[PDB]
Amino acid sequence: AMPYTWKFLGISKQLSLENGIAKLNQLLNLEVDLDIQTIRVPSDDEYIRYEMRLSKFIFLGNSKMEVPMFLCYCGTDNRNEVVLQWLKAEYGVIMWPIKFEQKTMIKLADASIVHVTKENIEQITWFSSKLYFEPRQFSIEIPRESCEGLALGYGNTMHPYNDAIVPYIYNETGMAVERLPLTSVILAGHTKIMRESIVTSTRSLRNRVLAVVLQSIQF
């Protein structure tokens, strides 16, 4: 139901994977598929986006940022480690595991559902939301419908969880999620966002999610 677990690594240098891919190919005895896209993420910014299919890798880079690029990967398959070590050897880059803080987890939740159409109209793919806490464990759940009626009554926001769901959880319930140890955010049949990883039902991540990840690791 939710098969794909993603791990995130920040990279000290921005990479042009086109210029080394043949060495990886000779290393693995196969021809990897490498897709390259220049993507735009409106705020109602531009990124270079690599995708490597062998188990999958996704790279997001931005030259006008201090920490210019990160990668994320899913599957296993130990060839992922081969890929990582190959990157470290071929490019001489420093890579570190990415851990998502609570605020960043909420931003991640917003990025997972919010998108913008051709005529710059905001749209939100709504799912039932489950907030998991661990100081002992307890969770709160807001069904899809309630979430939708919550979005409309705020109303227009690129951050429905931070602008609507959570403050409403304060007003009517009396709970400050910001004051509580949030360990997981579950969007039913879509995505689970944790501190150290993101799980998805599909074999990909929203571009907005990638953008939020890259923006979060800026020293």
So where are the chain's domains?
Answer: 1-219
Q: Distance between CA 114 and CA 106 in Å, rounded?
A: 12
Q: Which residue has the tokens 């595991």?
A: 97
Using CA of residue 206, residue 37, residue 100, residue 63, what is the dihedral sign?
A: negative
The structure's method of determination equals: X-ray
Contact of 72 with 200, CB cutoff 8 Å: no
DSSP string, the chain: ---EEEEEEEESS---GGGTHHHHHHHHTS--EEEEEEEE-----EEEEEEEE--EEEEEE-TTSSS-EEEEEE---THHHHHHHHHHHHH---EEE----HHHHHHHHHHTTEEE-TTS-EEE----EEEEE----EEEEE-HHHHHHHHHTT---S-HIIIIIHHHIIIII---GGGS-EEEEEETTTEEEESS-EEESSSS--HHHHHHHHHHT--
Find the helix packing angle between 102-111 and 207-216, rounded to 10°. Answer: 160
- ∠ CA 41-20-75, nearest 5°, is 65
Encoded tokens for 152:
């409309």
Measured CA to CA, the distance from residue 37 to residue 197 in angstroms comes to 24
- Residue (of 28, 50, 30, 31) closest to 39 by Cα position: 50
197 Cβ contact partners less than 8 Å away, ≥ 6 residues apart: 5, 6, 7, 8
97: phi > 0 → left, psi -120 to 50 → alpha, else beta; which? beta
Listed resolution, Å: 2.5
The number of beta carbons lying within 10 Å of the beta carbon of residue 168 is 16
Instruction: Supply 175's token pair.
Output: 């709970």
Run of H or E including 182: strand 182-187
Measured between alpha carbons, how far is 157 from 18 in angstroms, rounded to an integer? 38
| Calpha distance 189→15 (Å, rounded) | 33
